[model samples]
Target: FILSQFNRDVYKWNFLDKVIDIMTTNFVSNTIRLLQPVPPFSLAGSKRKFETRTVVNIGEQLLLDLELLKEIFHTLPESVSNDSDLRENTSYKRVKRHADNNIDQLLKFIKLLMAPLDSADDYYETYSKLTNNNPDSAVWSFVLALKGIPWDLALWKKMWSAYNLETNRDLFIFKWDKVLLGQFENNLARMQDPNWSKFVRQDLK
Candidate 1:
């Protein structure tokens, strides 16, 4: 098995180091993109304002970075536990078990790293600053994001509030075909959100 064109010449330590750098770079960049709007250099007329498509697109890659980090973090500890030299040591085994059990918490460390929804302290500060020192972009970015949220999500006034920003529904990014609450509900009886489930019987948009 040749990891040719890639790790064939790279040492394991260096390979691991490069992996860490890849994960860190992608995660940080993706998080920032999600929290902010497209830069001036990347904007156009309709794209001139805040947008949700970018965040949703960024989210797809962001989740990939998240999954990779989780995989590597879990693999490292499990590898240690299975090694012949470490297997006989009861205390070491227990330590490995503890680490394994707390793996989610370990990932949460990465999970909380520089991501919003938890960065309220500096989140809002950077939010407005990046939207060209204006709140209109900020409002639209949020509105677009919310507009694209899942139907199960508890939205406000059926997104009438968001309608104020982008008057034309054609610009709306979330085009989940006309899914009725009752019709959609039959397919997703697994969700437990009372708000979603209740509205599942009434709301259609």
Candidate 2:
């Protein structure tokens, strides 16, 4: 499912290099903050292997081994191929490199949000209401142009999701759309909304 989406996003931008850069740099560095210095054997997901699998391994290569994720992301079919063809989530799959070894205890130190996702749990919608006519009103934005280098949109949105570090790193990085840039309005036009603080900083109130 997501693999096609990522392929299309990269295809639209037509910059495979940037995609790679974002993966290794943006996704990698933030992952350091998200995971352990020495990542565990398998960063499996919310459900145990009996049902679900999102095991990304940190192996002899170093950080996330894109061994499986690479072709779907970079060299799959031609870019002209519409993602509408991709039928299921089976297209994109993440696997752990080495198995039968103990996953590091340190891997659990940095936590991610649990499931039963609520729009209210994440500040995105709340902040959008607080600051009208704008999606980028809140800290978690899809506009990679302004926030790309500085803001780390992937981090906050993933935090909003139902899973934590257990979620696939691809989910964290794969999302990129020009439409989500909020470009039509004025390169992320600013608005005034003193009312929105409650959703963001509870301490301030």
Top TM-score prediction, candidate number: 1
lDDT of 2 at 139: 23
Candidate 2 per-residue lDDT, tens place, 1-205, comes to 4675656544544453444444544433443333321111112211122110121222213322334344445442344345645443232211111110101211111111111123334434333332232322222332111121222234434433421222112222212322222231232232122222232343111
User: How well is each residue in 1-205 modelled by candidate 1, as lDDT tens digits?
Assistant: 7664475323443444444445554544344344532322111212333234544454555456667766674465344343556444454444445434333332332332223432333434443333333333223333323223323243333342333333322211112122222222244343355664454344422
Which regions of candidate 2 fall more than 4 Å away from where they truly are?
1-14, 35-65, 81-205
- Judged by whole-model lDDT over C-alpha atoms, candidate 1 comes out at 0.38
lDDT of each: 0.38, 0.28
For every model shown, the clashing-pair count is 0, 2
Number of the top candidate by lDDT? 1
